[PDB]
Amino acid sequence: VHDPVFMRNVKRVLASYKESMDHSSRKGMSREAFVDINEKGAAWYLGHMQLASRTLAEKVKDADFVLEIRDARLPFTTGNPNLQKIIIDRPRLIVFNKAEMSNEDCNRVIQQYYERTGNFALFTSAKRSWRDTVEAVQRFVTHILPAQRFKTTANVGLVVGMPNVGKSTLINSLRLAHEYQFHKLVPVCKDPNIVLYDSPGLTLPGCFAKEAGLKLAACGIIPTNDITLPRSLVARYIYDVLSAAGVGEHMAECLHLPRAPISFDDCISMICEGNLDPSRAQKFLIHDFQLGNLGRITLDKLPNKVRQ
Amino acid sequence: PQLFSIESYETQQRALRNIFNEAGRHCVRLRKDSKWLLEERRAFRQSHQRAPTTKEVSPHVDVALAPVGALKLSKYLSPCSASREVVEHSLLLHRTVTKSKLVQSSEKTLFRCLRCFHVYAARPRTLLRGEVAQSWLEYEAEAEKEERARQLARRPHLRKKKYSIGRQRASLANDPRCCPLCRSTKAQWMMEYVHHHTHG
Amino acid sequence: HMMDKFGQPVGAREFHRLFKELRHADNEAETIERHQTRLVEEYGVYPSLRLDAYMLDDDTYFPEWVNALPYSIRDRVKFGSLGLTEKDEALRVTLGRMPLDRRRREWERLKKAKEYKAAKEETLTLAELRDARQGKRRFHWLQRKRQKRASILRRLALRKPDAFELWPSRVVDYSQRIAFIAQHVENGLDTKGQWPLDPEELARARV
Amino acid sequence: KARYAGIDDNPTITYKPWDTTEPLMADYGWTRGKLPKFRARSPFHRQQIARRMVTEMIRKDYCIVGGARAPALRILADHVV
Amino acid sequence: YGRRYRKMETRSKRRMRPYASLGEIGLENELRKEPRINAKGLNNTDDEDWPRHTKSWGDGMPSMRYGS
Amino acid sequence: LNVDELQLVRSKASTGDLDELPESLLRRYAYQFSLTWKRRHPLSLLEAVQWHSTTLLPQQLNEEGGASPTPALRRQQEDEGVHKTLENYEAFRIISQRTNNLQVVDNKEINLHLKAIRREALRKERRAEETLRREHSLLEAAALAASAKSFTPP
Amino acid sequence: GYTRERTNRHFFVARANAFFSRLPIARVQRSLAMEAVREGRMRPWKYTKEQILGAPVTCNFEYNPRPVRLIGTVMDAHTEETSIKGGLKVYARNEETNMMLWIPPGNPKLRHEVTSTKGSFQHYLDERDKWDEAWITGRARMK
Amino acid sequence: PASRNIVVPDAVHAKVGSPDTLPAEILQKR
Amino acid sequence: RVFHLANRLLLDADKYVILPTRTTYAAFFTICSLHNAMPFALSRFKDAVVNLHVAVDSTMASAILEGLVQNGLVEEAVLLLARLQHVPMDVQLLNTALEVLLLSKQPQSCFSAFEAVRHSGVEPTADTYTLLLLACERSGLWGNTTAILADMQMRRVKGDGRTLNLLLKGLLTERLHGYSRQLYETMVNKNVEVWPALESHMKSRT
RNA sequence: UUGUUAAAACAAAUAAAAUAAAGUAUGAAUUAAUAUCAAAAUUUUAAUAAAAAUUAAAAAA
RNA sequence: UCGUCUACUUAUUAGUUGGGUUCGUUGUAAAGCAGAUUUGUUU
Ligand SMILES: [Zn+2]
Structure with missing residues (x-):
């Protein structure tokens, strides 16, 4: 037992922490949208992703290949605009996670366009482990990238992806796997000499427009809090996308509705009609859109040039 | 569309x-x-x-x-x-x-409590002081307590006439910070209440 | 409540009385059960008749030795088996206050009502469902008995701790180790499958 | 502040002489409106002491008591008379 | 914490709630002699409420707190 | 379930006189907008439908039909209401100033405390989050069951 | 530095509770009550608590332009005879609005008249249960 | 309900050059 | 009606002087898990533990944890398991805690608990081994895939068909040719079915 | 007052009333350089200065 | 010393379509530049 004054002090500070964290109210600003964990520690990046074009170019010039991680629901809006603007000489492998919910037709269209451009699209499901993904990445490296000059050197892949998409989870999984096998970078397979290099700030989007935030909250990337962004702004956009699709009978069959709804108020009242208030009803609708019982959905549009 | x-x-x-x-x-x-x-x-x-x-x-x-x-x-x-x-x-x-x-405001106004549901006339500043949670209303409360201590420390007998049980009970009735029936600090503006009832 | 809150640790004789009662509680239950079964098998005074006698406040339904039984069990041997509520006790007082013919008439009416209630008790009403979901117990005499038993246990173990310990001291607790690992999981501390672990590190991760 | 003894049961046609007291239950206090409370362990203990004291007073026609028990005993004997 | 052992012992041993009226002490005397359903139970002797002035030895002997 | 022209005519006629309009139209409009009309008072239906036509802001219809009058009549009704509130408040003032102590409670009690609203909201949110966790765990268990069989060794 | 809180001054410490006997104070109370009666601010009443308890009453509070009328049920009468003390406990319900007032007699701008000295304890119990249920509902909706 | 056709046209919403497409920073600066 | 009767039994025991037992509470928890009404089971568990002074049993804890898991409250089950303390050790509670830690966020924690109980305690069975192998499949470490087989051999406890199939899959992933071929031969000798993907992979390798 | 549940119940914690815990005898222990010990303000000398000096006047239990 | 800079440009037409991508006031030449700047024997 240490000093009693120190015991009293730690008791007092723990009680203060408890009385500070007892409040269930969540603050407006999404801390997750700006925090980004790395090897040095938790970092907060400010600014958009356009003013970092040369900082991205100087690193994609050093890296051997470009491993990007995006979400299949909204491919283009999650990533880097300068990567799509300026052509990257290095081969790119784009892993679309949560591919079970995206439109199969849009998935084949985007993978066809990536094959036409020179990139390789890999769609990963929840049942698939990261081992098959990293094995396919190794196969891509040994099939596309040329042989290194010196035998001891390794090929580097710059990882571009938001921490909500699964980049941080993949990094942690590979790190723990390597640590358990042996007991700023991350080695995956030592026989082909493949290593990965992460860039937190270049992938952290930071600020976003209204519709961008709507799409991110509908996909589950950005958090949702009552002070900053009510559920109405996102659920009405979801229903507007569903109405632009025009599948009213399909909405009814999915939500177990007596008839095809006419308006958003009608949708809310019909979901309310188990009994629950409109707020939790809209929360359950958004949760349905998150879990993905509604399938073959793509919120991000495709430009004319990518559709050609 | x-x-x-x-x-x-x-x-x-x-x-x-x-x-x-x-x-x-x-x-x-x-x-x-x-x-x-x-x-x-x-x-x-x-x-x-x-x-x-x-x-x-x-x-x-x-x-x-x-x-x-x-x-x-x-x-x-x-x-x-x-x-x-x-x-x-x-x-x-x-x-x-x-x-x-x-x-x-500090003028007399109808304020009802929600605990025993008693309607009484109170002054809004001293009654709603604990609910509003304004620092300038907190700093003036700490300022007036010092102002009273300055007068009482200068003359101790000044407390005898100013602060007496007859004077203390009279001031509490002048500023009813709590209901005289339930002794609860929770209160409500009756004007807003009657405005909400006769319309709802 | 006051004794359990501000109870000075008991002396030798009080400890002995508490231990004796706690040890012979089972013998007391066995002997009251034996008295009741002897009564119902040799005299035919069934629990229905015993409850009727309880409500009418009549001792003719019981033989002579019932009132001669020990006082510690004389009150339980008669009306301990059959179920009774605080409402039933209040109704017994009301009957005892009311006249005898009204006693019998209202008791027969209430007995018919209770039999119909028992027939209808197949399902649960909304109030009973709410009480079962909340955890509130209207008939907390079992709770009072268990709380008295726990208070006796505490007042008896406060004198000699090694006398009535809950878990053996020398025996290690694999369930406590599993709960330790589950606390690691709860706090999110990375467990690399390497046993043992560091409790100081778990506490640091917790804070 | 309020005495539940004022709640009258089985009221008679004519109002009682006291109409507010028991009158045996004295509601001992220190203000002049009440009886002097002799030091006891509880109000129940005080009532038990008063009961035994007035019983012995009625039994043996005299009682020698110390402290504030004498005025209470005298007033209770008055109420008994 | 400052709670006196003797005083707390007396408080926890004996009751404090005083009677309110003679009708109330009568109702209490009625409702007291009631059997315990599942409790421990206490001995209800045939002279528990009867006058103990002739039973107990010290109820007539000279007393100082009562003054003979 | 309402024609556009019929809804426009109803919204234009409710400001002037809604008595001549049939009440079945108002009933079905309340059904559409998910309104609550009292079944024991026929005036409740017309009051609800006129106040809902008030709160509804057709960007083109009202601005073209009556820019000033459509809010003007509603402001007149609001002036009537605020004068009624002033009268009732003066009545409460005089009765509380004359009587010794006065108590007031409402059986409907149309008033909700702010902390109570927040607590109910977070409570229903926690229940919905528990059900969301149920769904998530079911999905993860199904994914594990699929990976235990479909995954082939390389 | 130093001050004194108590004063042993003779004029302050002397009392007159012994000489209060030569003042007919109860007669002064009755004279004030009779003056109020003759002015019309109150009207003499002789009923008992159980008799008046449960009797309908109408009270008009005079107020320009319209005096406010209120019909309620007497819940409690504080005095059995007329006096300057008085006190009545009325309970009145409007459309979805319950209220419990304590009417003091003798107010010139307040005219309260009980429609009948006789009362119905059954209706009294009904009003009491209604008021208690309303109060409990209000407290439960508050907390 | 999983493989049902749900396609979104590009002319219904999210027009190019809108205050919703542009972030609030640029609009406030302008 | 079955749920109503299940709650009525406990209400009747509460009304009477008797008290329900740990097996009754476990069966009631399984009933609530079947009925998808977990708040009732949790309220009954609280009423049994905090004021009724009924010590928790191994089967009772395993039943309530299995109910939480089946309803899908894996995090709440983890919390309750962390709160658990002073309960006898049994293979049922062991495999239930293994399921809980498998479905939890950290699949390595159940492996750590198994290595902790490996020194002493109740002997693990084929179900516990299947749970360990499923957790290894979910996580992806597989570093002790042959260690599990060595432990089973030294424990001298037979394995089930699913156990042997998962072990075959683990060995094929860990490219242990000799051990995989030996296990395939002994599986064909025992005449126990295998997974179709594993059989196709074996036939393509041969 | 807060929190939990349900369309009132439970747990916490203090601030008002109430209850007790002597004015009787019995009677220790921590402590102890000391003038019948320097009430206060100002200034100053080697670190709180209760060390010095200058104003001033600080009653007894 | 708390400054500002998510659009210019090259073409195209009448909103559509492909390429490329900071400035500056004042002090100072050390009196300027990492980080900390807290203490009630208080219950
Ligand atoms: Zn009040």
Whole structure:
């Protein structure tokens, strides 16, 4: 037992922490949208992703290949605009996670366009482990990238992806796997000499427009809090996308509705009609859109040039 | 098509902005406190370096009531209506703003408690002091306690006449910070209550 | 409640009485059960008749030795088996206050009502469902008995701790180790499958 | 502040002489409106002491008591008479 | 914490709630002699309420607190 | 379930005189907008439908038909209401100033405390989050069951 | 430095409770009550608590332009005879509005008249249960 | 309900050059 | 009606002087898990533990944890398991905690608990081994894939068909040719079915 | 007052009333450089200065 | 010393379509530049 004054002090500070964290109210600003964990520690990046074009170019010039991680629901809006603007000489492998919910037709269209451009699209499901993904990445490296000059050197892949998409989870999984096998970078397979290099700030989007935030909250990337962004702004956009699709009978069959709804108020009242208030009803609708019982959905549009 | 469901949410919110700016013309004049008024005249001379203007200091508090349409709006709106949350939140915000303007007055006003449901006349500043949670209202409370200690420390016998059981009981009845029946600090503006009942 | 809150640790004789009662509680239950079964098998005074006698406040339904039984069990041997509520006790007082013919008439009416209630008790009403979901117990005499037993246990173990310990001291707790690992999981501390672990590190991760 | 003894049961046609007291239960206190409370361990203990004291007083026609028990005993004997 | 052992012992041993009226002490005397359903139970002797002035030895002997 | 022209005519005629309009139209409009009309008072239906036509802001219809009058009549009704509130408040003032102590309670009690609203909201949110966790765990268990069989060794 | 809180001054410490006997104070109370009666601010009443408890009453509070009328049920009468003390406990319900008032007699701007000295304890119990249920509902909705 | 056709046209919403497409920073600066 | 009767039994025991037992509470928890009404089971568990002074049993804890898991409250089950303390050790509670830690966020924690109980305690069975192998499949470490087989051999406890199939899959992933071929031969000798993907992979390798 | 549940119950914690815990005898222990010990303000000398000096006047239990 | 800079440009037409991508006031030449700047024997 240490000093009693120190015991009293730690008791007092723990009680203060408890009385500070007892409040269930969540603050407006999404801390997750700006925090980004790395090897040095938790970092907060400010600014958009356009003013970092040369900082991205100087690193994609050093890296051997470009491993990007995006979400299949909204491919283009999650990533880097300068990567799509300026052509990257290095081969790119784009892993679309949560591919079970995206439109199969849009998935084949985007993978066809990536094959036409020179990139390789890999769609990963929840049942698939990261081992098959990293094995396919190794196969891509040994099939596309040329042989290194010196035998001891390794090929580097710059990882571009938001921490909500699964980049941080993949990094942690590979790190723990390597640590358990042996007991700023991350080695995956030592026989082909493949290593990965992460860039937190270049992938952290930071600020976003209204519709961008709507799409991110509908996909589950950005958090949702009552002070900053009510559920109405996102659920009405979801229903507007569903109405632009025009599948009213399909909405009814999915939500177990007596008839095809006419308006958003009608949708809310019909979901309310188990009994629950409109707020939790809209929360359950958004949760349905998150879990993905509604399938073959793509919120991000495709430009004319990518559709050609 | 277009953003029908999005524009409908924006249209209803624009209506709430207009019907609440309309209710501003229905006001109830409340004369400010004597000590608080001199505190605004003092802070104005140091800020603007000029004598205070009778139209800027506003010795009469302009409190705004909730619009007559809004109370009957949430009334006939079913709980299953999605548009009830956006108008309920609009009323909860105005219900607190009304408290913020009410605490600046010191004239006698009807205040009922919610514990034993007793209606009594109280002064809004001293009654709603613990609920409003304003630092300037906290700093003036600490300032007046020192001002009383300065007078009592200069003359100890001054406490005998000023602070007596006859004087202390009289001042508590003059500023009923709690209900004389249930002794509860929780209270409500009766004017806002009767405005909500006869319309709902 | 006051004794359990501000109870000075008992002496030798009080400890002995508490231990004796706690040890012979089972013998007391066995002997009251034996008295009751002897009564119902040799005299035919069934629990229905015993409850009727309880409600009418009549001792003719019991033989002579019932009132001669030990006082510690004389009151339980008669009306301990059959179920009784605080409402039933209040109704017994009301009957005892009311006249005898009204006693019998209202008791027969209430007995018919209770039999119909028992027939209808197949399902649960909304109030009973709410009480079962909440956890509130209207008939908390079992709770009072268990709380008295726990208070006796505490007042007896406060004298000699090694006398009535809950878990053996020398025996290690694999379930406690599993709960330790589950606390690691709860706090999110990375467990690399390497046993043992560091409790100071778990506490640091917790804070 | 309020005495539940004022709640009258089985009221008679004519109002009682006291109409507010028991009158045996004295509601001992220190203000002049009440009886002097002799030091006891509880109000129940005080009532038990008063009961035994007035019983012995009625039994043996005299009682020698110390402290504030004498005025209480005298007033209770008055109420008994 | 400052709670006196003797005083707390007396408070926890004996009751404090005083009677309110003679009708109330009568109702209490009625409701006291009631059997315990599942409790421990206490001996209800045939002279528990009867006058103990002739039973107990010290109820007539000279007393100082009662003054003979 | 309402024609556009019929809804426009109803919204235009409710400001002037809604008595001549049939009440079945108002009933079905309340059904559409998910309104609550009292079944024991026929005036409640017309009051609800006129206040809902008030709170509804047709960007083109009202602005073209009556820019000033459509809010003007509603402002007149609001002036009537605020004068009624002033009268009732003065009545409460005089009765509380004359009587010794006065108590007032409402059976409907149309008033909700702010902290109570927040607590109910977070409570229903926690229940919905528990059900969301149920769904998530079911999905993860199904994914594990699929990976235990479909995954082939390289 | 130093001050004194108590004063042993003779004029302050002397009392007159012994000489209060030569003042007919109860007669002064009755004279004030009779003056109020003759002025019309109150009207003499002789009923008992159980008799008046549960009797309908109508009270008009005079107020320009319209005096406010209120019909309620007497819940408690504080005095059995007329006096300057008085006190009546009325309970009145409007459309979805319950209220419990304590009417003092002798107010000129307040005219309360009980429609019948006789009362119905059954209706009294009904009103009492209604008021208690309303109060409990209000407290439960508050907390 | 999983493989049902749900396609979104590009002319219904999210027009190019809109205040919703542009972030609030640029609009406030302008 | 079955749920109503299940709650009525406990209400009747509460009304009477008797008290329900740990097996009754476990069966009631399984009933609530079947009925998808977990708040009732949790309220009954609280009422049994905090004021009724009924010590928790191994089967009772395993039943309540299995109910939480089946309803899908894996995090709440983890919390309750962390709160658990002073309960006898049994293979049922062991495999239930293994399921809980498998479905939890950290699949390595159940492996750590198994290595902790490996020194002493109840002997693990084929179900526990299947749970360990499923957790290894979910996580992806597989570093002790042959260690599990060595432990089973030294424990001298037979394995089930699913156990042997998961072990075959683990060995094929860990490219242990000799051990995989030996296990395939002994599986064909025992005449126990295998997974279709594993059989196709074996036939393509041969 | 807060929190939980349900369309009132439970747990916490203090601030008002109420209850007790002597004015009788019995009677220790920590401590102890000391003038019948320097009430206060100002200034100053080697670190709180209760060390010095200048104003001033600080009653007893 | 708390400054500002998510669009210019090259073409195209009448909103559509492909390429490329900071400035500056004042002090100072050390009196300027990492990080900390807290203490009630208090219950
Ligand atoms: Zn009150």
